[PDB]
Ligand binder design. Structure first.
Ligand SMILES: [Mg+2]
Ligand SMILES: [Mg+2]
Ligand SMILES: [Mg+2]
Ligand SMILES: [Mg+2]
Ligand SMILES: [Mg+2]
Ligand SMILES: [Mg+2]
Ligand SMILES: [Mg+2]
Ligand SMILES: [Mg+2]
Ligand SMILES: [Mg+2]
Lengths: 116, 60, 59, 100, 131, 172
RNA sequence: AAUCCUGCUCAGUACGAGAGGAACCGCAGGUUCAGACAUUUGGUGUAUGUGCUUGGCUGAGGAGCCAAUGGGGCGAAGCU
RNA sequence: AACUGCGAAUGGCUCAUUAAAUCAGUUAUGGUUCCUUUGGUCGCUCGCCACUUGGAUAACUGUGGUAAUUCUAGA
C-alpha cells in the first residue's frame, strides 16, 4: 500500500511489480513489465497500440450550464424599497411622468421669464 | 485543506478548513466546472450542491 | 443554512450607470422620472458631515 | 485482508496457486523462501534458540498482500478489480444475450 | 545513522562511465573500487554510491594521466531499492571527488540516485535532481 | 540592537568603557562563553544558537573547531541603580560598553595573546574546574600580569564536575 | 562452518601542553563462504504460444507448408 | 486608481561583424508601402429601439494561496 503508480500504457502498477527507468534529462517513467518497457524503448507510440489505455480512450472504446437571475440590494438603498419601487403601480408611474411633463412646462415658464 | 465557499446570492464567502480526505473524496478526482454535492461535508451541508470554480496548488 | 454565508446579503457595490440598465432594472417604460430614479449613495464618516451623491447616468 | 486493505480476498492468487491448487484451510506465512517444491510437506518446529535480537522480537503488521496471478505477469488483484477495469467483453456479451 | 543496503553492482574494473561534473573530464575509466576485499578471479565491481579510483581517458590534458577518486552517481544496471522498486538509469555516470568527499566540480548534469546522494551530502547538494 | 547614533553617544564616554579579553587554555570554553555573552549583551548582537558566532570568522576555524584568528566584539547593556552602587569607580550612567577581544589559547599563538592584551585593560580568565590550572592558563596569566592587566576569574564546565566527576559539594 | 570489515553512539570523551585521539555495552549494515528459493527483477525459450516478414510451393482468397530452428518481436510453465 | 488612444521602432552607447558588402556621388521605383501633418471625400448606393440597442469588463467591496516576483485565483 505505497503510492499507486501508473505505467505509460495506463495500467496500474502495484508495489513490487514492474520496473522504473530514470532518464538523463531528469524524467522518470514506470513500466508494468518488459513488454511495456521494450515498447517504450523502441519508441512506439502508445496511441497505435490496441491494448493500451491511451488507445482505448482515443478510439472511444468503452464509451448543463447554469443561468441565474438573482435580484439583490444595491448599496446606499433598501432591499424592500427597491422591489416596491420597481413594482410601482402604473397609475403612479403615469402620474409621475405627467407631473414631469408639467414640471418641464413650468421650467419653460421660468426660462422665458429669466430670458425677459 | 482550506476550501473557500462562495454563494452568489448572498456573498460573504468564507473559508472552511477540512482535515478528512474520506469526506473530501466527493471533490477528489473530479474536474472544475462540474457540479457535485457537498452533502458529505456534514448534515449541515446536506442538500447543498456546489460547482468547482478554481483552486491553488501547494506552491500557490 | 450555514451561518455567515447564507444570510446577511451584501448589497451590490454600485448601481447601474447606463440608461437602459437602470430602465430595465426598474421596469420604466418611457421617461418616468429617470433623472432622480438613480440610487443616491450616502457616504457617512464620523469626523465630518455625512452626505449623499448620485452617479453619472450615461447613454 | 489486512488492517488497511479491507478487501474481500483470500490468500490465493488470481487463478489459483500454480502447481498447488486452492488453499482453503489455515496457513502460515513465512518471511523468505523455504526448501522444497510446491506441495512438499514441511515440518515447522519451534526454535531451539532463545530469541532476543531485535529482528526476532519485532512485531509484524501487514499493510497489503499481493494476490495477482502468478501464472504469468498478472496485473489485477481481484476478479472485481479486473472486471471493473476491462468492462464488458465478448464472452460476457453473448452469454448475456442468450440467457436474457 | 543507517548504512546503505546492497545493490546490484554492474560496473566492474574497466568500466568507462560518463563524467557528469564540469571538471572538463568526459569519462572515467574505473580501475578499482574502495572497500573491496575481493576473491580469486573476481573483478571488483561498483554500484551507485560507491567510491572508485578512475582515470579520465577523454578530457582536459591536465587530468588525463592521473588517478582520481570518483563516485558513481548513476548506473545502468537495474537494482532493487529495498521496497521492490527496480530502478535503472539511461547511462552510467560519475563525478570526481577527493578523499574527504567534497566534489571537485561544481555542478552535476542529470539525476543522482538516492543512495549516492544520501551517502555523500556534498554530491547531493550539487545534484540537479534526485531519482 | 540599536543604531550607530547611540553607539557614538556612549562611545564618547570614557568612564564606562571596559576593554577586556578572555584568556584560557586550549578547549576551556572560551568560544562558548563569548557566544553566550554575544547572545546576552551586544551593541547589535542577537542570541543566535548556530554553534560558534562571528568569533570564529574563518571557514577553516569552523571546519576544525579551533579558534585561530582573534575576533573583536562589542557589548552594550544596562544595569539597575542598585547594581550601580557597587561600582565605586568613575560611574557615568547605566549604560556600559565592553570591547571584548577573543584570544586563541594555543601556545603558538602567544603573540596573538600579546596583541589582544596590549589593547585590553582587563582579562576574564576561564579555568576549567575539571582540569584545574593548566599550562596555557599559567602562561597567559604570566603574560597579562607582566603587562599590568587586572584578571578576574570564572571557573567553567561546572556541570562536568557535578555529573561526569560526581563530586560531592564539600570536595567541589 | 561460519568469517571479517565499516558507519553511528560512547565522544572531539578518557589520555595528552598541544596536535591529535581511543575502548567495553548497544544500534545499522556490508565482505568472503555455506545452504536454499523463484513472489519480485533479469536470462533462456522449439509451449515451434502468438503476431510480423523474405524466397519459394499449394490455380487465387482463406488456411498452410519448406529453407537441417528461415529470420525477427513479444512470451506462459520450468530451470536459473 | 483603472479601461481606452498614443508613445515605448526616437534618442543614448559601442565599433564586434562586414572588402562592390557597408558607404559617397548619381539615378529609378511607368517595380512598392507609409501611423502621423496638410488639402481633397464623409445624406452621391433607394435599405415594435433611433428621443440611441446588447453582453460584459475594469478600477472597486469582500475571501485568499505562495518563502518569494510589478504572480494572480474565487464571488
Ligand atoms: Mg456622455
Ligand atoms: Mg510466475
Ligand atoms: Mg586468475
Ligand atoms: Mg513468403
Ligand atoms: Mg494469404
Ligand atoms: Mg518439398
Ligand atoms: Mg537443403
Ligand atoms: Mg526474449
Ligand atoms: Mg500606430
Amino acid at each position: 500500500m505505497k503510492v499507486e503508480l501508473c505505467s505509460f500504457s495506463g495500467y496500474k502498477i502495484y508495489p513490487g511489480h514492474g520496473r522504473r527507468y530514470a532518464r538523463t534529462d531528469g524524467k522518470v517513467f514506470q513500466f508494468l513489465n518488459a513488454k511495456c518497457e521494450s515498447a517504450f524503448l523502441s519508441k512506439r507510440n502508445p496511441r497505435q497500440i490496441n491494448w493500451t489505455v491511451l488507445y482505448r480512450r482515443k478510439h472511444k472504446k468503452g464509451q448543463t450550464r447554469r443561468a441565474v437571475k438573482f435580484q439583490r440590494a444595491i448599496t446606499g438603498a433598501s432591499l424592500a424599497d427597491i422591489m416596491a419601487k420597481r413594482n410601482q403601480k402604473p397609475e403612479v408611474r403615469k402620474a409621475q411622468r405627467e407631473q414631469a411633463i408639467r414640471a418641464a412646462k413650468e421650467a419653460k415658464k421660468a426660462k422665458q421669464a429669466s430670458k425677459k | 485543506m482550506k476550501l473557500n465557499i462562495s454563494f452568489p446570492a448572498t456573498g460573504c464567502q468564507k473559508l472552511i478548513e477540512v482535515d478528512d480526505e474520506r469526506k473530501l473524496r466527493t471533490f477528489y478526482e473530479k474536474r472544475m466546472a462540474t457540479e457535485v454535492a457537498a452533502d458529505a461535508l456534514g448534515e449541515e451541508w446536506k442538500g447543498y450542491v456546489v460547482r468547482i470554480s478554481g483552486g491553488n496548488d501547494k506552491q500557490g | 443554512d450555514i451561518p455567515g454565508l447564507t444570510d446577511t446579503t451584501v448589497p451590490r457595490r454600485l448601481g447601474p450607470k447606463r440608461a437602459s440598465r437602470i430602465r430595465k432594472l426598474f421596469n420604466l417604460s418611457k421617461e418616468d422620472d429617470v433623472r432622480q430614479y438613480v440610487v443616491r449613495k450616502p457616504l457617512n464618516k464620523e469626523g465630518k458631515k455625512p452626505r449623499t451623491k448620485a452617479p453619472k447616468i450615461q447613454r | 485482508s489486512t488492517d488497511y486493505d479491507l478487501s474481500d480476498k483470500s490468500i490465493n492468487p488470481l487463478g489459483g496457486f500454480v502447481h498447488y491448487g486452492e488453499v482453503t484451510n489455515d496457513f502460515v506465512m513465512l518471511k523468505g523462501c523455504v526448501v522444497g517444491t510446491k506441495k512438499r510437506v514441511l515440518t515447522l518446529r519451534k526454535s531451539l534458540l532463545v530469541q532476543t535480537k531485535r529482528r526476532a522480537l519485532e512485531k509484524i503488521d501487514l499493510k497489503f498482500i499481493d494476490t495477482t496471478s502468478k501464472f504469468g505477469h498478472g496485473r489485477f488483484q481481484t476478479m472485481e478489480e479486473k472486471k471493473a477495469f476491462m468492462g464488458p467483453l465478448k464472452k460476457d456479451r453473448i452469454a448475456k444475450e442468450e440467457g436474457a | 545513522s543507517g548504512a546503505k543496503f546492497r545493490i546490484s553492482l554492474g560496473l566492474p574494473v574497466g568500466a568507462v562511465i560518463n563524467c557528469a561534473d564540469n571538471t572538463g573530464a568526459k569519462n572515467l575509466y574505473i580501475i578499482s573500487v574502495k572497500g573491496i576485499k575481493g576473491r580469486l578471479n573476481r573483478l571488483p565491481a561498483a554500484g551507485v554510491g560507491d567510491m572508485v579510483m578512475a582515470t579520465v581517458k577523454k578530457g582536459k590534458p591536465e587530468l588525463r594521466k592521473k588517478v582520481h577518486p570518483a563516485v558513481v552517481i548513476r548506473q545502468r544496471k537495474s537494482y532493487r531499492r529495498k521496497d521492490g522498486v527496480f530502478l535503472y538509469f539511461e547511462d552510467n555516470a560519475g563525478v570526481i571527488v577527493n578523499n574527504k568527499g567534497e566534489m571537485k566540480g561544481s555542478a552535476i548534469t542529470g539525476p543522482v540516485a538516492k543512495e549516492c546522494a544520501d551517502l555523500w551530502p556534498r554530491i547531493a547538494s550539487n545534484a540537479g535532481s534526485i531519482a | 540592537n540599536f543604531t550607530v547614533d547611540q553607539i557614538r553617544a556612549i562611545m564618547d564616554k570614557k568612564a564606562n568603557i571596559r576593554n577586556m579579553s578572555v584568556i584560557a587554555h586550549v578547549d576551556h570554553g572560551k568560544s562558548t562563553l563569548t557566544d553566550s555573552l554575544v547572545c546576552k549583551a551586544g551593541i547589535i548582537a542577537s542570541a543566535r544558537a548556530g554553534e560558534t558566532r562571528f568569533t570564529d570568522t574563518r571557514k577553516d576555524e569552523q571546519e576544525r573547531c579551533i579558534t585561530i584568528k582573534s575576533t573583536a566584539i562589542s557589548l552594550f547593556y544596562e544595569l539597575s541603580e542598585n547594581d550601580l552602587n557597587f561600582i565605586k569607580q568613575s560611574k557615568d550612567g547605566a549604560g556600559f560598553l565592553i570591547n571584548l577581544i577573543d584570544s586563541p589559547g594555543h601556545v603558538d599563538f602567544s603573540s596573538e595573546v600579546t596583541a589582544a592584551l596590549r589593547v585590553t585593560d582587563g582579562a576574564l580568565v576561564v579555568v576549567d574546574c575539571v582540569s584545574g590550572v593548566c599550562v596555557q592558563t599559567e602562561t597567559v596569566l604570566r603574560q597579562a600580569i607582566a603587562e599590568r592587566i587586572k584578571p578576574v576569574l570564572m571557573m567553567n564546565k561546572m556541570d562536568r564536575a557535578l555529573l561526569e566527576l560526581q563530586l560531592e559539594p564539600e570536595e567541589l
